[PDB]
Curated annotation (Swiss-Prot):
Residues 3-68, 84-151 form the KH domain. The chain holds residues 193 to 354 of 579 of the full protein. Disulfide bonds: none annotated. Belongs to the RRM IMP/VICKZ family. It is found in: Nucleus; Cytoplasm; Cytoplasm, P-body; Cytoplasm, Stress granule. RNA-binding factor that may recruit target transcripts to cytoplasmic protein-RNA complexes (mRNPs). This transcript 'caging' into mRNPs allows mRNA transport and transient storage. It also modulates the rate and location at which target transcripts encounter the translational apparatus and shields them from endonuclease attacks or microRNA-mediated degradation. Preferentially binds to N6-methyladenosine (m6A)-containing mRNAs and increases their stability. Binds to the 3'-UTR of CD44 mRNA and stabilizes it, hence promotes cell adhesion and invadopodia formation. All KH domains contribute binding to target mRNA. Domains KH3 and KH4 are the major RNA-binding modules, although KH1 and KH2 also contribute. The KH domains are also required for RNA-dependent homo- and heterooligomerization. The integrity of KH domains seems not to be required for localization to stress granules. This is Insulin-like growth factor 2 mRNA-binding protein 3. Can form homooligomers and heterooligomers with IGF2BP1 and IGF2BP3 in an RNA-dependent manner. Interacts with IGF2BP1. Interacts with ELAVL1, DHX9, HNRNPU, MATR3 and PABPC1. Expressed in oocytes, spermatogonia and spermatocytes (at protein level). It comes from Mus musculus.
Length: 162
RNA sequence: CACGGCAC
């Protein structure tokens, strides 16, 4: 019963749609996926993005992630946001060696198995008090969701072993 | 900001 959450970085402008008027959208998500979801109310001063923490079973976590991806994609269409919205996962640096693997073998396997392109933020962009690397996943809603499942499997495995 | 909230 691993208790490491999934942490996402989403554009600030899509949070209103994720939560929904009176909280109705996120309330439905957390009910349906049996998840605890915490949306940061203050932007990271890094960029125009807010972090979302999702605590659930691996399956409930993946379902909540996909729901958020679906909501974001629909809002972008609705406001004619033309740019791509990659999935961004934050992961503590202590887990990223295993996600990448020797010679990048593990990350390349996830890219092939899910048809995505995954890039991880550079090690020297960390700060002493922000140890979280940004995992950027470019793909469709469907492939990004599959990538999240595989990515978090390796993160949890690192979490329980490294 | 569509702004919700499951404690120890």
């Amino acid at each position: 019963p691993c208790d490491l959450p999934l942490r996402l970085l989403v554009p600030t402008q899509f949070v209103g749609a994720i939560i929904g008027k009176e909280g109705a959208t996120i309330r439905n998500i957390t009910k349906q996926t049996q998840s605890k979801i915490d949306v940061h109310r203050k932007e990271n001063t890094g960029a125009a993005e807010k972090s979302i923490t999702i605590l659930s079973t691996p399956e409930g976590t993946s379902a909540a992630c996909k729901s958020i991806l679906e909501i974001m994609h629909k809002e972008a269409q609705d406001i004619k946001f033309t740019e791509e919205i990659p999935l961004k996962i934050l992961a503590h640096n202590n887990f990223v060696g295993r996600l990448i693997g020797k010679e990048g073998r593990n990350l390349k396997k996830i890219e092939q198995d899910t048809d995505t392109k995954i890039t991880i933020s550079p090690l020297q962009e960390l700060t002493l008090y922000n140890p979280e690397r940004t995992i950027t996943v470019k793909g469709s809603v469907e492939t990004c969701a599959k990538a999240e499942e595989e990515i978090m499997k390796k993160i949890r495995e690192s979490y329980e072993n490294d």
